[PDB]
Amino acid sequence: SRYTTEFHELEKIGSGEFGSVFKCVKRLDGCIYAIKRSKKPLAGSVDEQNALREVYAHAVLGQHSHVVRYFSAWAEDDHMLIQNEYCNGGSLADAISENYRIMSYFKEAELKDLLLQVGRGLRYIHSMSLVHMDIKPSNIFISRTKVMFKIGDLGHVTRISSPQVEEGDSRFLANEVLQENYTHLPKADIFALALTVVCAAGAEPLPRNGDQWHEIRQGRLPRIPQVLSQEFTELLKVMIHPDPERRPSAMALVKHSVLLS
Numbered sequence: 001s002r003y004t005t006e007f008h009e010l011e012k013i014g015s016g017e018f019g020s021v022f023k024c025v026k027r028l029d030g031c032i033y034a035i036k037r038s039k040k041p042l043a044g045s046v047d048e049q050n051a052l053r054e055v056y057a058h059a060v061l062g063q064h065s066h067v068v069r070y071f072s073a074w075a076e077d078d079h080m081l082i083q084n085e086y087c088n089g090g091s092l093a094d095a096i097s098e099n100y101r102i103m104s105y106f107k108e109a110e111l112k113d114l115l116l117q118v119g120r121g122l123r124y125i126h127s128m129s130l131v132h133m134d135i136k137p138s139n140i141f142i143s144r145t146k147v148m149f150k151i152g153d154l155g156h157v158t159r160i161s162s163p164q165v166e167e168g169d170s171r172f173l174a175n176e177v178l179q180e181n182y183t184h185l186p187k188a189d190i191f192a193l194a195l196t197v198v199c200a201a202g203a204e205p206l207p208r209n210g211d212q213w214h215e216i217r218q219g220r221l222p223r224i225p226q227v228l229s230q231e232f233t234e235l236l237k238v239m240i241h242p243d244p245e246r247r248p249s250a251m252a253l254v255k256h257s258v259l260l261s
């Protein structure tokens with residue numbers, strides 16, 4: 001197998017119904033990669049779309065400081081494999097779960113940094129006429145040496161002007177997308193990013209439905225247990241505005257005065 005031949009497994013770092021993700025060292029260069037190994041999806045099925053979106057996303061994207069880098073992908077033995085950059089700090093979900101287990105948080109300075117960096121990743125992706133459509137802390141990865149945030153798990157990436165929408169995590173999903181309005185999808189990434197930062201800031205777990213869910217889509221920010229500048233708060237506020245056209249574009253976001261630096 002090319003997998004065994006080119007790589008040595010070190011550690012299982014992720015798993016799901018699809019299969020697993022392994023931390024591996026490539027024998028030829030001695031570098032660490034995150035390799036996802038999954039059972040070959042049914043040909044034509046939704047999962048085959050997912051797998052295809054991920055590779056054809058790189059076909060357009062390539063390389064960027066705030067997108068998890070792809071190196072290769074292949075299929076063998078009824079499985080598919082994708083070789084990605086290894087981000088040694090895990091996902092923002094791990095970092096948050098580790099903040100809670102151990103009694104920590106993210107300073108306002110750090111929340112802004114998170115917002116700007118993922119913002120730069122979105123700026124790029126949108127500029128390539130694509131949208132990520134599954135922004136959430138578990139799909140934001142962290143490289144340390146001192147931190148770089150990188151957008152990964154491109155399995156939902158689709159076109160701005162010809163969108164095949166498999167709808168993302170309900171907790172981070174904008175209402176217009178649920179309403180089958182796909183005309184401003186870049187602004188759904190912006191909405192999901194806002195709630196991603198809210199999670200990082202220490203908000204209680206986001207609702208999947210119910211009145212709390214609807215109150216958020218009405219433009220009400222989840223409660224943040226720490227004191228943030230009103231300016232920063234308002235930015236997160238407008239980013240989840242019910243009118244997607246009122247939300248800042250990724251460009252406006254990365255150019256925003258409150259995010260200077």
Ligand SMILES: C=CCn1c(=O)c2cnc(Nc3ccc(N4CCN(C)CC4)cc3)nc2n1-c1cccc([C@H](O)C(F)(F)F)n1
Nearest residue numbers: 013014015021034035036068084085086087090091141152
């Ligand atoms: C290739 C697949 C997607 N992917 C990446 O491109 C990528 C890059 N860098 C890392 N770093 C990384 C993750 C986790 C950990 N852990 C977690 C905490 N644990 C106690 C042990 C250490 C350490 C370093 N990880 C990545 N990916 C990844 C790893 C696990 C799970 C999922 C996705 O949720 C899934 F859907 F693909 F499963 N993705």
Ligand SMILES: [Cl-]
Nearest residue numbers: 171205206208
């Ligand atoms: Cl939960």
